[PDB]
């Protein structure tokens, strides 16, 4: 049991690595939003919902990693 | 039995690392969408479905990783 | 045989890491498609099949990874 | 008990790797803010709250990593 | 002989990591092809063979990884 | 107690990896500052405080890594 | 002798990771070739040998990795 | 005590990995400096001190890594 | 001796990882050369020696890694 | 004594991974040099020393890694 528990904990730590993708990804979406609005302010109401969708989908991948982490911890 | 179970849990954590590619890839697609629409609002109905296809195919690679993760966990 | 089995499962996990390349690559191809069409809408029918070929070739590298993963899991 | 404790401390260290994602992502958001404002100073009041939101969401991913780290440590 | 076999299977999995380089590289080549053709449609016949060559040479690096993988697996 | 101490020192080293995110992110912010000022010198006073804020927030992610490192070291 | 053999096979797998560098690098060279020729078709005969040289030198780095792999295997 | 010593040396090695960030970051700052000056030579005296500050802050992250490395090697 | 030899071999494999930097770096230099010459063919004789220096310096870092590999192997 | 020596050699190999940052960073500097000179040949005497400074400081980070590698080896 102690070896299995040990592995659960190492596994949980490893499972957070993939969240780096969402950290970068969310930023890339928001960077495009800012650059898009700066170049064409009139487009703001069109691209803002696209940014919200983009960030939500990128974030979802990190949440998949976190779910695995929590399953290993709990 | 103990060591094998330990390995499954370590393996499950490692199998989520690949999800970072989808986290970044989804963002790259949505960034291109936002930048393309800002530069040419008239093209939005054409490029929006391309973004959905792009996102889905990128996400599919992360779902393959998750698949292996859940096979190892369960 | 516990050691060998343990190694198969760890190895199977490690074998999925390379799929991040297809995750990023497929996105890069589709981003170029979107930016290309935005800049020159008339080129769509020319570049769309290029993007399909591009995606499929990038994805194949990831499917090689997954193939090794399944060989370790099941073979 | 030594084995589980060992795993907690190694897991806690591994759990910080994902913070590199927020390190880079936060920067990408602020780079976009600076480049967007330099190109179009009049847009500053519009894009600045977008940058705050982008930073916060990217930062959150790194906070989920740190959460797992602190769970493993404490 | 169990330790050696274990090592072969660990080694085989590690040997697939480098395939990420071809996944990204093949995409980079196709991205340039699409962007080049969009900017200058008349150049299509000239640059398409360049893309095929670039793709093949990038893919070859992944195939060297896969070769080592299968040497280790079998 | 030797295994646990070993784990702390391994964990402490692993905990510095995430600092690469701040090394790159701080540079990305300063790169945008330099490029923004080169393109529009009149904007210097506006964007410099944005760069300071972006740098601090990126650096904070590395400082969270270093915090875990020192918790493990001492 | 089992321990040394094990290390040779794990070392051989690790030795292929560096090939991702050539995978990406070769692609970067060919992307530049395609973009340069699309922008200026008349320059093709000048830049094509530059691309062959660039590819070869980037590829060489991956070959040094494969060399170590084959030394460890054989 | 062999195990603890072994761990110090492995840990010291691992602690240098983060220096790749300063390697890349310092370069990024200097590239921006070069491109900024090329595009607008008159801005040189304004942006050169920004690049020095930028490099030094990026490098500090790597020096934190190396600090942990030396603590493990010698402390 | 067998454990030390085992470690030499793992160490050698790990020491090739850093060559990925030269693989990418050499390519980035050659990409700039190609793009520079395409935009301004008249500059070719000026930037070609800069490219040779750039690639040589980037390559040197990979050669440092390879030297460590060889010291561990021989 | 055996395990400690084993660790020094594994540690020495790991300590070269960081050199990839210098491999990439040196290239990024020289790419900017080439692109800046191509766009504005008249600035070459000004930006060339900036490139040398940039390269040296980037290379210094890789030399720090190598330093640790040689301390572990010798």
Swiss-Prot record, chains C, H:
For the site labelled Reversibly protonated during proton transport, the residues are 59
What SUPFAM superfamilies does the annotation carry? F1F0 ATP synthase subunit C
Q: What are the protein's UniProt keywords?
A: CF(0), Formylation, Hydrogen ion transport, Ion transport, Lipid-binding, Membrane, Mitochondrion, Transmembrane, Transmembrane helix, Transport
Q: Which GO terms describe its molecular function?
A: identical protein binding; lipid binding; proton transmembrane transporter activity
Effect of altering residue 53 to F? In strain: DS400/A3, DS401 and oligomycin-resistant mutant
Primary localization class, coarse: mitochondrion
**Which residues are modified to N-formylmethionine?**
1
Record's Gene Ontology CC terms? cytosol; mitochondrial inner membrane; mitochondrial intermembrane space; mitochondrion; proton-transporting ATP synthase complex; proton-transporting two-sector ATPase complex, proton-transporting domain
Q: Does the keyword Transport apply?
A: yes
Q: What is the effect of changing residue 65 to S?
A: In oligomycin-resistant mutant
Membrane topology recorded in Swiss-Prot or TrEMBL: Multi-pass membrane protein
Any Pfam family the entry gives: ATP-synt_C
Report if keyword DNA-binding is assigned: no
Q: Give the subcellular location.
A: Mitochondrion membrane
Q: InterPro entries of this UniProt entry?
A: ATP_synth_F0_csu, ATP_synth_F0_csu_DDCD_BS, ATP_synth_F0_csu_sf, ATPase_proteolipid_c-like_dom, F/V-ATP_Csub_sf
Question: What parts of the sequence cross the membrane?
Answer: 14-34, 52-72
Q: Which GO terms describe its biological process?
A: proton motive force-driven ATP synthesis
Question: What CDD domains does the annotation carry?
Answer: ATP-synt_Fo_c_ATP5G3
Q: How does it assemble?
A: F-type ATPases have 2 components, CF(1) - the catalytic core - and CF(0) - the membrane proton channel. In yeast, the dimeric form of ATP synthase consists of 17 polypeptides: alpha, beta, gamma, delta, epsilon, 4 (B), 5 (OSCP), 6 (A), 8, 9 (C), d, E (Tim11), f, g, h, i/j and k.
**Function recorded in the entry:** Mitochondrial membrane ATP synthase (F(1)F(0) ATP synthase or Complex V) produces ATP from ADP in the presence of a proton gradient across the membrane which is generated by electron transport complexes of the respiratory chain. F-type ATPases consist of two structural domains, F(1) - containing the extramembraneous catalytic core and F(0) - containing the membrane proton channel, linked together by a central stalk and a peripheral stalk. During catalysis, ATP synthesis in the catalytic domain of F(1) is coupled via a rotary mechanism of the central stalk subunits to proton translocation.
Q: Which family does the entry's similarity section mention?
A: Belongs to the ATPase C chain family.
What this protein is called in its record is ATP synthase subunit 9, mitochondrial
Q: Which gene encodes it?
A: OLI1
């Amino acid at each position: 049991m102690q070896l299995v528990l040990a592995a659960k904990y190492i596994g949980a730590g490893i499972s957070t690595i993939g969240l780096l993708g969402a950290g970068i990804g969310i930023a890339i979406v928001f960077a495009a939003l800012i650059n898009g609005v700066s170049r064409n302010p009139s487009i703001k109401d069109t691209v803002f919902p696209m940014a919200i969708l983009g960030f939500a989908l990128s974030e979802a991948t990190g949440l998949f990693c976190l779910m695995v982490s929590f399953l290993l911890l709990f």
